[PDB]
């Protein structure tokens with residue numbers, strides 16, 4: 001019921017935008033190296049600006065001098081296993097994803113370091129959907145848009 005989406009943003013530096021609907025907006029993290037199904041791998045996820053729910057369906061171009069083009073790399077629904085509001089606040093989200101590419105449980109983990117609160121890490125939870133990185137790299141295996 002709660003919408004999630006991952007956008008592949010080919011800007012100056014390639015990266016993935018990981019979005020989770022909550023309270024009528026999309027909580028968004030910029031994940032430079034993209035999500036990983038390997039529970040042993042920790043991917044940087046820099047918290048960024050909230051985006052409107054309809055942006056989840058956006059494919060196109062962020063104008064030059066402002067930044068490349070964007071596709072919806074994955075989409076579906078997400079479910080928090082623990083209170084999401086208190087989760088973002090305390091700096092830890094335990095949640096499940098139900099989409100095209102990413103599925104199973106995940107963790108968003110924020111650093112405790114003062115002056116670095118935008119620094120999180122996206123880690124795959126050990127479950128049936130977990131896949132070793134050297135056997136299955138979801139970025140390589142499923143590289144294209146789910147809308148076009």
Ligand SMILES: [Mn+2]
Pocket residue numbers: 009011015017030
């Ligand atoms: Mn971006």
Ligand SMILES: [Y+3]
Pocket residue numbers: 086089
């Ligand atoms: Y509180």
Ligand SMILES: [Y+3]
Pocket residue numbers: 100
């Ligand atoms: Y399918």
